[PDB]
């Protein structure tokens, strides 16, 4: 299936003319992964923009955060431009400082993801990364075929010897899976292009001990997963899923055994050691900064909170202790440093409409809410 990109543009800090800041563009909900994203200043692409490593969500749809240092002024216009197969022409979302542009059992998860993009018989690409929940802990350098340790504690309690062995295994695996798929696909060219995603790792749920998983998607839909010792086809992907599970269950018992030990024995060890080593960083508290803005629609009042970590937060418009319903909660969006951003909108009538305020509540604030008066 294909999914059109969602595009959201925001600044890391409140805009102050002449003062340096970061411009962020979050591109999400898209499929396939092939995408072009630029940040524009007055219609011209900014060089030396950075971006997060390609990731994807629960529904397999891809997400990327683009960011650059910028200095807003009164006059300068910034935007995010995206092109993608779902779009007949590039889509430009402007940054507006006033309004921007655009589960159950509690658990932690360590997992590796892979994205395999098969463009044609002569061209395929494998990429991947490691994640503690939504935090990236590991990258993968394609050229050298090596693990990139992103944090000082990214080795968990694993030895360099163990990590080197895993690294070599992953290198052989990425190359081999890509080639094996290309060999099957070279017998019918009209299947091209297509994409394969893997998510594999282990989860610690409250009340349970670690559980491994290995999940696969094809063109953005569940294809199959590893259940106990059996590759099980997604009910959703019918005949192709059945074929692939038959291959995996009957011609690759060595692969099966390797996946089993990795997700059921090595991954739990890795997860527990990683949480432990990264304790201080993962359970840190970072206070949000907060500010108000408005635009005409009747005003929209907009309350912003940016720079908070961890993610749970509560932001609401209040008319003297009365919480205003009619408040639109935006998405919680990432900043490049791992903190988060949120705006909350209230549509109002009249002028300055007596005592409106915005209340920001967050674990980091030591029981002292930020209250901003309009």
């Amino acid at each position, epitope marked *: 299936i294909q999914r059109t990109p969602k595009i959201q543009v925001y600044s890391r800090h409140p805009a102050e003319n002449g003062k340096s800041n970061f411009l962020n563009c979050y591109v999400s909900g898209f499929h396939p992964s092939d995408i072009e994203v630029d940040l524009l200043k007055n219609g011209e692409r900014i060089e030396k923009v950075e971006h997060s490593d390609l990731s994807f969500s629960k529904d397999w749809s891809f997400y990327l955060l683009y960011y650059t240092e910028f200095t807003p002024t009164e006059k300068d216009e910034y935007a995010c431009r995206v092109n993608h197969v779902t779009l007949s022409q590039p889509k430009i979302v402007k940054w507006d400082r006033d309004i921007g542009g655009g589960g159950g059992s509690e658990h932690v998860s360590f997992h590796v993801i892979q994205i395999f993009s098969f463009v044609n018989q002569s061209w395929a690409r494998g990429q991947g990364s490691g994640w503690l929940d939504e935090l990236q802990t590991h990258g993968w350098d394609s050229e050298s075929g090596t693990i990139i340790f992103l944090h000082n504690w990214s080795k968990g309690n694993f030895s360099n010897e*163990e990590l080197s*062995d895993l690294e*070599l*295994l992953f290198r052989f695996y990425l*190359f*081999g899976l890509t080639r094996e798929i290309q060999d099957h696909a070279s017998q019918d060219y009209s299947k091209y292009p297509f994409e394969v995603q893997v998510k594999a790792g282990c989860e610690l749920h409250s009340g349970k001990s670690p559980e491994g998983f290995f999940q696969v998607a094809f063109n953005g839909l569940d294809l199959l997963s590893f259940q106990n010792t059996t590759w099980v086809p997604s009910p959703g992907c019918g005949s192709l899923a059945q074929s692939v599970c038959h291959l995996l269950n009957h011609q690759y018992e*060595g692969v099966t055994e*390797t996946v089993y030990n990795l997700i059921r024995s090595t991954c739990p060890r890795f997860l527990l050691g990683l949480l432990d080593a990264g304790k201080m960083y993962v359970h840190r508290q970072v206070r949000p900064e907060a500010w108000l803005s408005s635009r005409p629609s009747q005003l929209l009042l907009v309350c912003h909170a940016s720079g908070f970590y961890p993610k749970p937060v509560w932001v609401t418009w209040m008319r003297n202790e009365q919480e205003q319903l009619g408040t639109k909660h935006g998405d919680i969006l990432p900043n490049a440093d791992g903190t988060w951003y949120l705006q909350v909108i209230l549509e109002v009538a009249s002028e300055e409409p007596a005592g409106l305020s915005c209340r920001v509540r967050h674990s980091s604030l030591g029981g002292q809410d930020i209250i901003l008066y309009w």
Partner: T-cell receptor
Amino acid sequence: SVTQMEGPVTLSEEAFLTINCTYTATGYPSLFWYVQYPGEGLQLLLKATKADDKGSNKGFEATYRKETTSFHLEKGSVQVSDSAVYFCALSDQYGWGKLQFGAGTQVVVTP
Amino acid sequence: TGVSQNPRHKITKRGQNVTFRCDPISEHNRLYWYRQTLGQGPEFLTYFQNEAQLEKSRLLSDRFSAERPKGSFSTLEIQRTEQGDSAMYLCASSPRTGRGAEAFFGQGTRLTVVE
């Protein structure tokens, strides 16, 4: 990653053969013995891909013992045609890696 | 039937380049070069998966280079041979039959570098 007994080991036809091999590994290696007869290339004798698996061939055996990290070669009653060089080996990367060989042990079986 | 290496023997003067060839069992995706000196175990030199050289020994001299252009035959070249290069150069290949797959060895190329 693989240490084996220094030879040569000389023994009489029908004597018991033991060649010690110990390994060091963090992961899930596959273990093996290769043999090289005089004038010949290397060839697999036997192997074991997991803890407690036993490989056996022509009276030789070796048991993968994870807790002593060992894969000792044994044969109850050696024959003259067993005169050769024996190499302990391991494949890391969960049994997908290159063979890493010990230094080898010459066995001389006298008639 | 098995892995084929050429030449079976090579005598060369110190300073000259040599190239050796391996033809693995066809259909084997994994190919490995090793060096063995009299009375010792093979030392790993390099590994190909198909055409891709996915692992080289950290100790491999910069004088040594291998290639496997079509995921089939491979060549090992030694530039400016030295006496210490004298050894049996082994090629082996393995199928993807699973964990602990058998490696099939050639009869080797015996190199003697003479003054």
